[PDB]
């Protein structure tokens, strides 16, 4: 009965040369019992990508909530929300539930369409923004992801190389966690093309 480790799951984001990558596993379980191997944890609102780990009901709820809020943003602003602005919206929304929080570990990833700059950010369950040049990690295998990223990562990787690095970071981290894995998805994001790849990984 620890809300952040009932369902399991992980998300990781990385920056490369004029690109960003965000990846997640596919598992949804109930403690020991694996239930679903199709549960994707990455969503997008326009060109801004959001990954969410933690309690699955809150993952779903927050996706629906940020779709709601970004849709109204676009109608009033007459433009797509940028990663920096969306990051602030996520932080505000989470801190609004300061003393009754969503049990989540969200991760923002995307490229600012005006400046062309790659942007990633992480949050704790109550809104503290954790910005990074290199990588953000989240989920039940966050220790493992920290270890994988901190050793495997190097700056200014090309999209095809960045794919290999982030995939190997996720896969090997997931395999040391009982609650993570059961499939994986990687998003490679360039200024105006996004490629989504499903990874072959061990299914235990």
């Amino acid at each position: 009965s620890d809300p952040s480790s009932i369902n399991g799951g992980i998300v990781v984001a990385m920056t490369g040369k004029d690109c960003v990558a965000i990846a997640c596993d596919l598992r949804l379980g109930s403690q020991s019992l694996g239930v679903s191997n199709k549960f994707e944890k990455i969503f997008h609102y326009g060109h801004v990508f959001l990954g969410i780990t933690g309690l699955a009901t809150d993952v779903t709820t927050l996706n629906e909530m940020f779709r709601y809020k970004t849709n109204l943003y676009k109608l009033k602003e007459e433009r797509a929300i940028e990663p920096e602005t969306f990051t602030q919206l996520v932080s505000s929304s989470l801190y609004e539930r300061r003393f009754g929080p969503y049990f989540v570990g969200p991760v923002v990833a995307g490229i600012n369409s005006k400046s062309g700059k790659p942007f990633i950010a992480g949050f704790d369950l109550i809104g503290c923004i954790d910005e990074a040049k290199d990588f953000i990690v989240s989920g039940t295998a966050s220790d493992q992801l920290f270890g994988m990223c901190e050793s495997l990562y190097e700056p200014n990787l090309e999209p095809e190389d960045l794919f290999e690095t982030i995939s190997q970071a996720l896969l090997n981290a997931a395999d040391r966690d009982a609650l993570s894995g059961w499939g994986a998805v990687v998003y490679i994001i360039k200024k105006d093309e996004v490629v989504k790849r499903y990874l072959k990984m061990r299914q235990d």
Partner: protein
């Protein structure tokens, strides 16, 4: 853990997984959960790794002392009862063990005993033990017949561990197979779930829940 053992026309199949965990941390994927006591006796391990490992290798020493003193291999019944009586002495102290003592003797034939740390000792044809036992039962019970061939029985034991390895978060790694005959136990290999799952999925057509 997941472990299992059953009896059929052609002896005993014994299969286990190979994962060790500390909470949600996957500690090992290569643990030996079958212990070879003698050429005719096997022991399976589930629960506390040290508890099982320590006391089952101790059991092996007691079995060796029996055959030195009695000039005859120990019965599966007497071997299992040494272990059960030992853990019963420690009852309440916090030992955690779910074990199966499998073997063949002339007087008994193929025999399986379930022995656990609260002192339960049961003779039976089929048992599944560990956190993934239910998943193994689901597949094993729904495909079990006494008249299975040695080839089919080996696969079913392997397939039942795979089933549990896939669904139980605390099971996995690889499958270790054993076949026990009138001539003793025979090892039938280590089978990594990493390759075995996809091979079974493709050839069998099962595991449609998984993204192919």
């Amino acid at each position: 853990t997941t472990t299992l053992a059953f009896r059929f026309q052609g002896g005993i199949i014994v299969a286990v997984d190979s994962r060790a965990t500390a909470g949600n941390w996957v500690a090992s994927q290569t643990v030996k959960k079958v212990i070879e006591i003698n050429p005719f006796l096997l022991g399976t391990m589930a629960g506390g790794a040290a508890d099982c490992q320590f006391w089952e290798t101790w059991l092996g020493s007691q079995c060796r002392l029996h055959e030195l003193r009695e000039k005859e291999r120990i019965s599966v019944a007497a071997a299992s009862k040494i272990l059960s009586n030992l853990v019963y002495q420690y009852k309440g102290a916090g030992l955690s063990m779910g074990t199966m003592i499998c073997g063949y003797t002339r007087k008994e034939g193929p025999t399986i005993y379930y022995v656990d740390s609260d002192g339960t000792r049961l003779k039976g044809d089929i048992f599944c033990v560990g956190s993934g036992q239910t998943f193994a039962y689901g597949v094993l019970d729904s495909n079990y017949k006494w008249d299975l061939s040695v080839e089919d029985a080996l696969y079913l034991g392997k397939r039942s561990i795979l089933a549990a390895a896939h669904r139980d978060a605390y099971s996995g790694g690889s499958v270790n197979l054993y076949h026990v005959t009138e001539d003793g136990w025979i090892y039938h290999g280590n089978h990594d779930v990493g390759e075995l799952f996809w091979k079974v999925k493709e050839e069998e057509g099962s595991f449609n829940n998984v993204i192919g």
